[PDB]
Amino acid sequence: QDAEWYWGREEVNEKLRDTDGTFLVKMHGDYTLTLRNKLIKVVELINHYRNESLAQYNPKYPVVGKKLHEYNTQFQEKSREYDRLYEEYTRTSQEIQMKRTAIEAFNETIKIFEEQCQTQERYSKEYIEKFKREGNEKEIQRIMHNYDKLKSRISEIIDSRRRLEEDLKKQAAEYREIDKRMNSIKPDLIQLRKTRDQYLMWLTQNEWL
Amino acid sequence: SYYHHHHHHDYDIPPSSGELWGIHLMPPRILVECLLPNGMIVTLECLREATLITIKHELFKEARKYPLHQLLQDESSYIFVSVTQEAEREEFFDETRRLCDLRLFQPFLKVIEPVGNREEKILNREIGFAIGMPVCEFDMVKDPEVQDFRRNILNVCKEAVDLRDLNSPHSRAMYVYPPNVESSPELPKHIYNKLDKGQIIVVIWVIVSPNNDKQKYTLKINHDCVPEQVIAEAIRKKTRSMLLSSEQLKLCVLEYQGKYILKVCGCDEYFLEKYPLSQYKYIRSCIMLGRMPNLMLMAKESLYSQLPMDCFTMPSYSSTKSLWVINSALRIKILCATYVNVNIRDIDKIYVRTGIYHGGEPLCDNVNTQRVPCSNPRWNEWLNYDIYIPDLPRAARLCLSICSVEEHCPLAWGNINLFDYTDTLVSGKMALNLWPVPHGLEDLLNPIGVTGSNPNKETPCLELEFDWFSSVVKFPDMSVIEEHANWSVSREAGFSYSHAGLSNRLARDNELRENDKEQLKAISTRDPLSEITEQEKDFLWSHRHYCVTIPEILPKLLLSVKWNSRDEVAQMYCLVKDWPPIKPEQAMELLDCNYPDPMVRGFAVRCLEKYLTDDKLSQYLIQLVQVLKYEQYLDNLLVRFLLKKALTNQRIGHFFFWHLKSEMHNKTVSQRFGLLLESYCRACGMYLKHLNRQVEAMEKLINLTDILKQEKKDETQKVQMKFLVEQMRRPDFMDALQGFLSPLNPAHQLGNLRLEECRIMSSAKRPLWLNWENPDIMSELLFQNNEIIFKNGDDLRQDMLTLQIIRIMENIWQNQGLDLRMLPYGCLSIGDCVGLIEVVRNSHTIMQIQCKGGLKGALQFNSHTLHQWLKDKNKGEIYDAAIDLFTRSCAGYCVATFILGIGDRHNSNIMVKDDGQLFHIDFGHFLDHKKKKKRERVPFVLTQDFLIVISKGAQECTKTREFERFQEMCYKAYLAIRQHANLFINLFSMMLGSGMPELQSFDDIAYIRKTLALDKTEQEALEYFMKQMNDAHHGGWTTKMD
């Protein structure tokens, strides 16, 4: 009866989850072969098909109690760490894109001011050459005052943008650094997870969990 | 001693923006740079809340006092413009708008003469506000498909708007205010019995002179008589007189009769066509709640007075080789993943896994070798796939993923349609930017993920190359596939008398066996998750022609076809061509991920077009919007269906807007949904402007709660609440938060705020309790005050679904004649963890019941207090009915809960109402998300408190008839749902789309199998449930009525 691969749906697919070629075995049928997920409707028939393929029959890998609590608290610790870092990832993704849009906005803003100091050059220096003597130093200063705002203002905006850009790179660095660690956690999450189910498999042959 | 003196040396004790960039709420007074046509800047100091009319009017006074004044025109010659936070140059036409409400990025205003001769047309602004992304963001998308969608979808919009002005103004009124009608006119047996032989007392109201005074007219008419009949009877009673003969009455009825229609007193609902009164939802509520309906006689030409015209205008934007000729297998060149984030320490080596798919794989999965591992990863292989290029099915897709090393581990994934939207096999070089692996996915390849690249630049961009056949290879026409089938079938007729793997084809001919015809229907009835074996597949596929007798087998049959055999597939396209239509609830299965084919899905849409009612559509609308994600291409039959129903019936439209808009944050659908929402908004009529007022309301609340949750934390509720109220007073809030329609149900208008009742709830998330005046004329007859909770923090859409599922469970139960009043309160997600929950007045948490019944000196809380508190509320014959309700409610919620396996539930999330109905709140994780750490749990564990109440009041409550009745409800409920388990699977199946962690892949849904016990027979399932119900309670349930 023991028969390794024989157990005798939900927990069939879960034991089959992450394994290609792996398998395990009333008024409807009897025994089903779930070869990875291909269900096929006893010890005689499987010893033949471990050696040979399934193409000639139908055209198109026969795989303590306190330790459960210890390895469960690692896994549950690691899952939070993974869950934490996936937010940090997804938030930074957003924050970054909000910067990029902001940088576009900044750039677009700057245009309008570059356009403005230009626009004023046109009409201001049309009004210097007409007349000249009338309101000479009076007019031309109070036009030049306004201009010296416009440009020194532009200056702040361009500094305001730069400062943002430099932050985008550090953000992008940290963004990289999160995925990097995630990708090193991920393999060892699965081995913790996989051994926890083999430990918990042997027992069955809540307060810990 | 405590900690074996072990030192933990390591341990150490130490959002979108709002009114301007990087700041939530602009300062009450502020400086704005005004860039003029003459090149002059003047910085204006002006208030946060000031209109542009005011700012402009002041600017051209203050400009006079700067040089070059004579170079400015009159102020009226100009319109403000600035850079917004979506980073586009918005022109500010609606100068009534306030400086805080402009979404301004930097506080400045450029002055211009208006660019576009069509000012009308640059109210695309209205659309992209509604949408939350500017329309100009679509015009500069290169992609033909997108442009093609946009131009082609107007076909549908035009047809919709045509259906509306058919019998203007009635049909317009019919659009806006579609009749709110229950599914069937048949009445359940328990509802009827509340009618003393088929009749309801109703109350019709009227308004005379000066229009202030109102007048009752209390009729008693048959349940099944209609609005026109009811409207007569009122006008009879209204105008009987001693001065009117009998015959002179008839003649004054007949002129009057159809100048009126029936409103519902207190909310914008109407009874606008030939329907049994019973069938309107308002009526049938009143019957169940023991209430006398209050309608209003409303004069058609005061109603049609209020309805506008739609104002629809068309937007400005108005040789090949057959696949099967290609004699070669598929091969794909991988090239170079440019970017990757891997520790060369921790990870050995990395490769690209690959596969072709149709939901499931049509060939052995393969990889390329473990090359340039980690540091600067590149492979220049040709992957070689064992499938011939003519056996690719229409819907085929490459699915790939970069991985790590049995140390097998995914890094970044991405899928590509092998055919474009124009039927063209993909050939050349592709740039495919990849998606990160989600939480619950440990698997390597992810084929139920989104078809398409990530739009995000800074992501693992794996580029690749596709074999070239000197020509644009195309998928064959139907004419062609029809002939291949006919030849394949005439070919079958004359095969070698015996064929092995007899699974291939019949061998029984026009006489198939009767033992077999019984095996087929027994398959047909098994749920969608009961996986089907290779025998059964072949067996189904052979008898495919008899399968047309049992249409409901189709889902199974389709999953038996070998999609990698164009012979089979072509044949299956001819079955499906004129397969008998099926029930909408059954056809929905066929729009999930398991059915990606365009002919299959086309069929399902034809089912809905025929059978699916505007009632049933709007019940399952959440599942139909979700299922759009699994459509290969933007433009398709399903989209064309929904969009048209949206533009046909404004009650659908409303939720269709919000469900799409809800998910706009999610870049797996932003393009698709934004584009669809553009269409809807372009053609929906004046509701756009109504929707924009809701949209502007929510943004303000979003910003309000955003500031409460950061910086205003670590202040006393006192300080917060004073801030809240202060803020809500400012004009911009009063403007924005008063004259509008509840998104929870737009039939309710939200009037002025009563800030006396507006408050922050105690939760950490800082949810707002908001209260509005019901500005209806007959407000008093329904509810004078209307209050709903706005919640900034939680993901509402898990709850949204269970509340849906419950609602549906209720309907099943009741419409089969078995009364189990559930209370699926309103819930609505409108953003990334943002939403609205209908308040139920006069309900309290059991905890509240117990603190309000806890005796002077602390001691312990009493089990009877619930009962005693309930008795206090219901005294007399009134008492007895209130227990039956608690029992009927407690039974439904027991079963629903257990089947769904929702979060464990306790004193602070079970609620009882004054009238004695129990209902649950805060469901949290539904299909047992916390088991990840065969529990088959009972989340609703009936303590004494409940049991005492259930049996009218006793000791040892297990042993009363009252409780035996209760159990018998629980069993008859449990089974009735079991018989509709197909639907429930399918509802959950269609929701795998959304990124809810509780719906990641189909075994998540498999919980509902064990709990409904679908593998067993019903007599066992009954007993399974009693077994389950007995060990959580420890007694009562195994006995059988002694």
Ligand SMILES: O[C@H]1CC[C@H](O)CC1
């Ligand atoms: O049998 C396999 C199992 C997984 C499903 O989603 C597809 C088919």
